[PDB]
Amino acid sequence: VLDQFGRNLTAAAMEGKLDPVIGREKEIERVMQVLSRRTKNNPVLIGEPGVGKTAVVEGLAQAIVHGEVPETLKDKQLYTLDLGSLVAGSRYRGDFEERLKKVLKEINTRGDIILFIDALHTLVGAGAAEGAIDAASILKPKLARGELQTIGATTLDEYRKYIEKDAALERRFQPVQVGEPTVEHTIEILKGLRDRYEAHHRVSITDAAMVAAATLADRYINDRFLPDKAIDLIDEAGARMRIRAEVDDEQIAEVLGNWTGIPVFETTRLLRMEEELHKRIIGQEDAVKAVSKAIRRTRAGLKDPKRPSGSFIFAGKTELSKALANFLFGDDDALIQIDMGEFHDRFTASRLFGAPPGYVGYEEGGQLTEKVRRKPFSVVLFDAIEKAHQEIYNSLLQVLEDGRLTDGQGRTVDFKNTVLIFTSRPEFLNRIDDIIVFHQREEIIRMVDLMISRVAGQLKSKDMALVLTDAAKALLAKRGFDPVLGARPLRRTIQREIEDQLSEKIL
Amino acid sequence: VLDQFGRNLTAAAMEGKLDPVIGREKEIERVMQVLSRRTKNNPVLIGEPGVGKTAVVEGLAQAIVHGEVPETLKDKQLYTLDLGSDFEERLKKVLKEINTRGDIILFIDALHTLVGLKPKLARGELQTIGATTLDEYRKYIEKDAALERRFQPVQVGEPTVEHTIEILKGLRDRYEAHHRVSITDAAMVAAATLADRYINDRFLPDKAIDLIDEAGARMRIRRMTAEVDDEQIAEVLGNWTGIPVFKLTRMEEELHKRIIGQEDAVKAVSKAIRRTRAGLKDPKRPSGSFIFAGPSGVGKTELSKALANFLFGDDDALIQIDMGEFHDRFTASRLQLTEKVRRKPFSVVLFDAIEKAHQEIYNSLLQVLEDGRLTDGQGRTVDFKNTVLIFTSNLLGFSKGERMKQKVNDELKKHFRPEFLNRIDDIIVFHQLTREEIIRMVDLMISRVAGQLKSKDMALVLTDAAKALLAKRGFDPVLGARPLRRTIQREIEDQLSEKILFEEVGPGQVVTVDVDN
Amino acid sequence: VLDQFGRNLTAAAMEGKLDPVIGREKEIERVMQVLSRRTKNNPVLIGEPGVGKTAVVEGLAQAIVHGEVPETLKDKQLYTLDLGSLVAGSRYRGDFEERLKKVLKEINTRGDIILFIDALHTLVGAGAAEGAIDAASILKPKLARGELQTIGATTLDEYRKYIEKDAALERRFQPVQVGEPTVEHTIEILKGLRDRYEAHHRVSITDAAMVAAATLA
Amino acid sequence: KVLILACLVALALARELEELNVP
Ligand SMILES: Nc1ncnc2c1ncn2[C@@H]1O[C@H](COP(=O)(O)OP(=O)(O)OP(=O)(O)O)[C@@H](O)[C@H]1O
Ligand SMILES: Nc1ncnc2c1ncn2[C@@H]1O[C@H](COP(=O)(O)OP(=O)(O)O)[C@@H](O)[C@H]1O
Ligand SMILES: Nc1ncnc2c1ncn2[C@@H]1O[C@H](COP(=O)(O)OP(=O)(O)O)[C@@H](O)[C@H]1O
């Protein structure tokens, strides 16, 4: 009856079907502290999806079969009542409430049941979103009297959106904050899961493979959370061993190269950082080794805990920052131009940092949470900073001291891993780490050969003629350059002379 | 029981009653990795309808009988779950198959139907392979967190045009034997090419199968009162979409023979369209990125109409979207556009009023131009690189007494971004309509009027002098296709209407305007 | 028999009780193509209400009677499936089970039946479903394993709501796009229907009235 | 300075329905 909507976690614990939890036994003690109450003995595990909240009550179910519980929690059977399974297959009036009363009938009958309602935010809005009888209004009488012990588990956002907004429901449940682990806490989690892996995958897992699964998932994965995405890396590591046995750290770096997409895995590449930055920039090599120099300190050596990863003034400029973003964690598209020449007024200062609520631009601006700290590292370029109002880069004085921006929607976006670069008061300039000077005919013609080879490599692959002359590279150097300005986007001169006459080859 | 659930896809795989799955072997590899997990097992196989999700598992079913599987999946059967084949009694004997055989691996086509039976297989007791669409994953399967702790997304995309050809070469003999005709290599290499171009409501690894199945089916029909090639499958597409077989089977500059005037700008855009039908540039970059700067009302919107004619077959199926309505993401979430370009594998999209936009959108405006990729909410890359880009933009004392060509190009860099014209294939500046170009536009608009009067049995010829008055009342140097149509109503049509109601003209004759100034 | 739970559409075609469809030959042969396939052998005729989806299979019934048909489906009796008469009088237990098994064994008994289910969305989700399996789940295994070829006709909207709901239907039904006629094709239809309306109203209909009625509509 | 537009949805109204017995 109650087996039709979830499994018995206590019966799975005494059959050894549950993964052991190492650490978070202060969280399990807090849940027992709620469950041993009289009146509202219903904990809700507040977390975020993958920190281990099923794992908390998986450890509570193991604690019951070990007898490490109070006398009000011994011989209790935990059932992961999926209330979404109660909604599923319920097309009719009253069909939903019938298989919830069958569940609550076995609560009254057994008397030793602790429901684990995963995704407790679903409890509001199971029949009518509190407009009528939902699954919340069915449970709220028995939850308030301690006659139904229910462990909820929900995200902190979903606790605020659904459980806190129903003020009658929030008193029935007691928030047990299950925090995201630390990396050193994740490694000792995976030590006890080594026995579960080696029995299943037929692998042997070395010691630092855990270290390269927990540090490395924190470094490149930010959508997922610690004690899940690191289990994922050891999972996908044996999924390369099912293609084949000892896993490496390179075995985890392989399967994160599948997941995130970057293959770059820092001391070796930081020394010859210049050469991987020369592959897109030839000419003006003094600034290349200059922005290589300060970053050899920040990512190798000593660093303040509250600073961006280098700060620069640029006075190609933006082509170097795109190659700088490619070395930074492995992606070309991390460079975000703000175009500070598109803002001149004081009321437009809220159009790039977020609006105060109620006002225009509450989402045009204030999306920086989903941009900057969504990526593990970033380079934010402020193109034409001299055209802005003073009031706009008074707000950039936060992120040069601390590396924190307060969105207009109330979010703290950390710029502490972001290379903040300005491009053209003494208080604004001394917080910037460097002043890097770009100098404005032999350097242009070498960028001609760099940029025609990207086009011509594809051209002859589709059986097209390649007719070039080194004298004509100097003709590309005259138009695609400006002393008063800057090398008139040579690429526009290449599509002038080469790509327009590319049509005049089939004719 | 055991066989009322569905079909053993692995008893069918060793028997040979299962089709060969050629191509997409890396996705079969990804499935058997996820099947080999203990924490996140049982892959849900995600793909749009017809891309091969049954076929990946039908390839996995052939993998277990070949020894292309680990010791985990070796000698492990795979049944499919037909829910259409008392109901709730047998569906919990599905979960009995752990204790019954222990070789059970379930394939559930349309896994989203199981959530709002719903075998919860005591959390993770029955191996499972799902099959769902990108959006049906993120609305039914991804929404419920108990289902998400175990099932893993495996992305199966639509095959590329050249990858579909190798699929059809492997599926050749089954259609060669069923329709008893020898389908040739031409029909294969023109199947996916002609199915991708002229169909977007279904995907290539099916729609290309659908025409070689049906062209072979038309052979077995018309033998009753034995080779299929490019022309025979082009005959089949014309009988479906209707698109003239000839069409299915450069630029010709003919565009100018529909529109009025602006002759050099017609030959200017025809050289870059001729380039991209050979695909000589980078296919990552968009096909044609044109800015139609210059005077409005000289027939520059109509040039896009003929370009929509020349590259559809249809006259007008071109996408019209408006900009300048934006100060919120609530309004700019339409960048309407993501669903109509989804229906059109090629379109001619026209961007008007692009001098007016919110300042943050100019960052995301480059992703239309530089990338041609805009991933929408259903998790799908909307193309703009197999789609031509048309940027329609309209830009004292005693000195008095007409090249503004480079002068337009100067404020192009100023009103827009200075790297916006980096990704433009050619720039177009139109001319003001001269006295001989505007007079044949008068022929175009009165041809609608004479067509309306042909229906009530009369034809009227206007003299060349009468059209000289209309062509100068309907032209000013800011416009000229826009005020001309109003002046034909206010001078020709409003007079002709009351003259055929009072019957000054009356029934059938020819009237001719012979104006005095 | 199928005559009690439907009507013979080719016997209605040889008794001259079906309206001729002048034109529409590309879509009638389209149905005959996607009947002769091996994986999607089921034509479902999608189209907006009024474009003549039923008139295609009635034009197919006239094609069989006239002998304008391949001799793989020559003398192949089209029966439209009246779901009304199939449900009507199923007052006792298992009648609608038994009736729909009878009309499917009578197809396999003779083999000169190709079945047309008008409003194929009505088949999905209705017919007995309280204590027995419905109409669609009886058709479903004979459509999946293959013992039975329907011709279907849904609205373009109703095709997405009921047939494109489960994938195991989608891999057996081929949507045949029955489009709107153009105005010139409609005049060809109306000139071919002219004898049926000159005889019913005993009026004459001019060529002007045909080209008016297609253009003005 | 700018409205929010709550935009109330309509619901499907999970239905009772009569059924048909057979003896
Ligand atoms: N090609 C045709 N030739 C002759 N008559 C036609 C043709 N196409 C349609 N008609 C006629 O037009 C009308 C269309 O009705 P019909 O039921 O065939 O359309 P339908 O699209 O199937 O409609 P519904 O969606 O209601 O089933 C009928 O009078 C039919 O005989
Ligand atoms: N403290 C822990 N010890 C061991 N495993 C843990 C721990 N926390 C989480 N896990 C792992 O997390 C997975 C269970 O999901 P869980 O993290 O509980 O999800 P959520 O936090 O969404 O409830 C299992 O792989 C389990 O081993
Ligand atoms: N790689 C492939 N090799 C062979 N046939 C394929 C391949 N991909 C798809 N197909 C065929 O195309 C059709 C796709 O339908 P199906 O396999 O059900 O996939 P989906 O679930 O995406 O509709 C089937 O006929 C299938 O056999």
PDB file of N, CA and C and ligand atoms in Angstrom, chain C residues 19-22 24 48-55 155 185 189 193, ligand 1:
ATOM      1  N   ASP C  19     -19.740  11.637 -54.457  1.00  0.00           N
ATOM      2  CA  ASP C  19     -19.498  12.746 -55.363  1.00  0.00           C
ATOM      3  C   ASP C  19     -18.128  12.593 -56.002  1.00  0.00           C
ATOM      4  N   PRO C  20     -18.001  12.821 -57.304  1.00  0.00           N
ATOM      5  CA  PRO C  20     -16.690  12.707 -57.940  1.00  0.00           C
ATOM      6  C   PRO C  20     -15.822  13.885 -57.551  1.00  0.00           C
ATOM      7  N   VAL C  21     -14.520  13.646 -57.448  1.00  0.00           N
ATOM      8  CA  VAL C  21     -13.578  14.718 -57.161  1.00  0.00           C
ATOM      9  C   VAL C  21     -12.677  14.883 -58.370  1.00  0.00           C
ATOM     10  N   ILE C  22     -13.022  15.817 -59.250  1.00  0.00           N
ATOM     11  CA  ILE C  22     -12.188  16.135 -60.400  1.00  0.00           C
ATOM     12  C   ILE C  22     -10.987  16.891 -59.860  1.00  0.00           C
ATOM     13  N   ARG C  24      -7.409  16.192 -57.524  1.00  0.00           N
ATOM     14  CA  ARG C  24      -7.080  15.457 -56.297  1.00  0.00           C
ATOM     15  C   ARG C  24      -6.409  14.108 -56.594  1.00  0.00           C
ATOM     16  N   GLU C  48      -7.359  20.786 -42.763  1.00  0.00           N
ATOM     17  CA  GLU C  48      -8.358  21.610 -42.120  1.00  0.00           C
ATOM     18  C   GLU C  48      -9.753  21.126 -42.502  1.00  0.00           C
ATOM     19  N   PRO C  49     -10.755  21.345 -41.647  1.00  0.00           N
ATOM     20  CA  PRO C  49     -12.097  20.815 -41.930  1.00  0.00           C
ATOM     21  C   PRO C  49     -12.726  21.474 -43.147  1.00  0.00           C
ATOM     22  N   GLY C  50     -13.025  20.660 -44.150  1.00  0.00           N
ATOM     23  CA  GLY C  50     -13.636  21.135 -45.370  1.00  0.00           C
ATOM     24  C   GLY C  50     -12.795  20.951 -46.604  1.00  0.00           C
ATOM     25  N   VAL C  51     -11.498  20.663 -46.481  1.00  0.00           N
ATOM     26  CA  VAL C  51     -10.619  20.572 -47.636  1.00  0.00           C
ATOM     27  C   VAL C  51     -10.814  19.286 -48.411  1.00  0.00           C
ATOM     28  N   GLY C  52     -11.581  18.346 -47.883  1.00  0.00           N
ATOM     29  CA  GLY C  52     -11.937  17.172 -48.641  1.00  0.00           C
ATOM     30  C   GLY C  52     -11.132  15.951 -48.281  1.00  0.00           C
ATOM     31  N   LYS C  53     -10.869  15.766 -46.987  1.00  0.00           N
ATOM     32  CA  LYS C  53     -10.162  14.584 -46.504  1.00  0.00           C
ATOM     33  C   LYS C  53     -10.989  13.327 -46.702  1.00  0.00           C
ATOM     34  N   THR C  54     -12.277  13.392 -46.371  1.00  0.00           N
ATOM     35  CA  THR C  54     -13.174  12.279 -46.640  1.00  0.00           C
ATOM     36  C   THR C  54     -13.363  12.103 -48.140  1.00  0.00           C
ATOM     37  N   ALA C  55     -13.290  13.200 -48.890  1.00  0.00           N
ATOM     38  CA  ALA C  55     -13.442  13.143 -50.335  1.00  0.00           C
ATOM     39  C   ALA C  55     -12.249  12.507 -51.028  1.00  0.00           C
ATOM     40  N   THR C 155      -8.327  16.104 -38.300  1.00  0.00           N
ATOM     41  CA  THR C 155      -7.982  17.503 -38.465  1.00  0.00           C
ATOM     42  C   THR C 155      -6.503  17.673 -38.129  1.00  0.00           C
ATOM     43  N   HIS C 185      -7.994  25.138 -58.693  1.00  0.00           N
ATOM     44  CA  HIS C 185      -8.347  23.747 -58.456  1.00  0.00           C
ATOM     45  C   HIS C 185      -9.776  23.615 -57.968  1.00  0.00           C
ATOM     46  N   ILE C 189     -12.933  21.470 -59.288  1.00  0.00           N
ATOM     47  CA  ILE C 189     -13.800  20.664 -58.434  1.00  0.00           C
ATOM     48  C   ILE C 189     -15.256  20.998 -58.698  1.00  0.00           C
ATOM     49  N   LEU C 193     -18.371  18.836 -60.008  1.00  0.00           N
ATOM     50  CA  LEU C 193     -19.549  18.619 -59.189  1.00  0.00           C
ATOM     51  C   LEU C 193     -20.813  19.191 -59.800  1.00  0.00           C
TER      52      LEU C 193
HETATM   53  N1  LIG E   1     -11.469  17.002 -54.885  1.00  0.00           N
HETATM   54  C1  LIG E   1     -12.771  17.124 -54.659  1.00  0.00           C
HETATM   55  N2  LIG E   1     -13.637  16.866 -55.666  1.00  0.00           N
HETATM   56  C2  LIG E   1     -14.950  16.989 -55.431  1.00  0.00           C
HETATM   57  N3  LIG E   1     -15.574  17.349 -54.316  1.00  0.00           N
HETATM   58  C3  LIG E   1     -14.688  17.601 -53.341  1.00  0.00           C
HETATM   59  C4  LIG E   1     -13.317  17.515 -53.424  1.00  0.00           C
HETATM   60  N4  LIG E   1     -12.742  17.851 -52.206  1.00  0.00           N
HETATM   61  C5  LIG E   1     -13.760  18.127 -51.423  1.00  0.00           C
HETATM   62  N5  LIG E   1     -14.965  17.985 -52.060  1.00  0.00           N
HETATM   63  C6  LIG E   1     -16.288  18.221 -51.518  1.00  0.00           C
HETATM   64  O1  LIG E   1     -16.188  19.284 -50.596  1.00  0.00           O
HETATM   65  C7  LIG E   1     -16.805  18.904 -49.343  1.00  0.00           C
HETATM   66  C8  LIG E   1     -15.716  18.552 -48.366  1.00  0.00           C
HETATM   67  O2  LIG E   1     -16.239  17.595 -47.420  1.00  0.00           O
HETATM   68  P1  LIG E   1     -15.254  16.456 -46.887  1.00  0.00           P
HETATM   69  O3  LIG E   1     -15.904  15.728 -45.760  1.00  0.00           O
HETATM   70  O4  LIG E   1     -14.738  15.662 -48.037  1.00  0.00           O
HETATM   71  O5  LIG E   1     -14.065  17.347 -46.299  1.00  0.00           O
HETATM   72  P2  LIG E   1     -13.130  17.083 -45.032  1.00  0.00           P
HETATM   73  O6  LIG E   1     -11.986  18.038 -45.052  1.00  0.00           O
HETATM   74  O7  LIG E   1     -12.874  15.620 -44.941  1.00  0.00           O
HETATM   75  O8  LIG E   1     -14.126  17.488 -43.851  1.00  0.00           O
HETATM   76  P3  LIG E   1     -14.163  17.084 -42.298  1.00  0.00           P
HETATM   77  O9  LIG E   1     -12.961  17.709 -41.655  1.00  0.00           O
HETATM   78  O10 LIG E   1     -15.445  17.647 -41.778  1.00  0.00           O
HETATM   79  O11 LIG E   1     -14.133  15.578 -42.266  1.00  0.00           O
HETATM   80  C9  LIG E   1     -17.737  17.756 -49.732  1.00  0.00           C
HETATM   81  O12 LIG E   1     -18.925  18.250 -50.334  1.00  0.00           O
HETATM   82  C10 LIG E   1     -16.862  17.032 -50.753  1.00  0.00           C
HETATM   83  O13 LIG E   1     -17.581  16.157 -51.595  1.00  0.00           O
END
